[PDB]
Amino acid sequence: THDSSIRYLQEIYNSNNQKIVNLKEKVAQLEAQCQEPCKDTVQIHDITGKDCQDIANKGAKQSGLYFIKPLKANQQFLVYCEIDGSGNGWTVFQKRLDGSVDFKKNWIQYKEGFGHLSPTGTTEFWLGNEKIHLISTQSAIPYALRVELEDWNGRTSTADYAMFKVGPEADKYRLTYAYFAGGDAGDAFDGFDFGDDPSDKFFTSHNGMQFSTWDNDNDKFEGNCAEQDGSGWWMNKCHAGHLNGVYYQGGTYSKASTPNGYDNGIIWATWKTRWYSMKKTTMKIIPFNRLT
């Protein structure tokens, strides 16, 4: 007689029928742990204002991403604010540190901006000309400009300009400053005496120049500086300071490396030969009354 037989199959059944009930509870517990998305490291700060210095003055202590809205701006925009312990807040508008982003862009792109903003300041970008204009002319309070450079041997240098301003698109976002305010990188925006030509310096200065891109020529050359050197900048037949140039791994490059035959790198002639390209670059502005 199949005594225990049908009695055993009943134990197994009833048993792995209680296991099923238990496994389901454990499943639901699992489902509860898989409802949240991946954690994003980049986050935006709550505080806001006219510029970084304003945000600094309101308590902001760490460097990162903030929204700002200059007086005449009709919409707010994201920016990277550099804030040190002394209470100074810088509004960065240009960064180079690895040739990951292409700077051979057109007029609209240099206007609206391109690249990426990181909370760590480890990304390349160009905040647009429109924003740089709104920030630097929002009021009468004069702004200063600081250019930071790093070569391929850890050495850094700076260049400061007072009363820094960028005009409207109506005037091709012309570049302007009152005077060079010092710095060991030298006043390249003043032009450089490259050689024999009696007017090298006059041709390579930048104060007063309008912005140029391959599709919108506003330089003082008969050809197209932006098109040849492949970039967007305040050209003048052409340049002596070129921060939005072609990134060359290792700095040193030659005429054979370029396609048009001219120095198209990230140069600052008063600090390095025009055949040496920077490894890092930074352009930022802060109210002048903050350095003095």
Binding site: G195, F203, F221, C225, K237, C238, Y262, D263, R274
Partner: peptide, 4 residues
């Protein structure tokens, strides 16, 4: 740089 400069242009001739």
């Amino acid at each position: 740089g400069p242009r001739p």
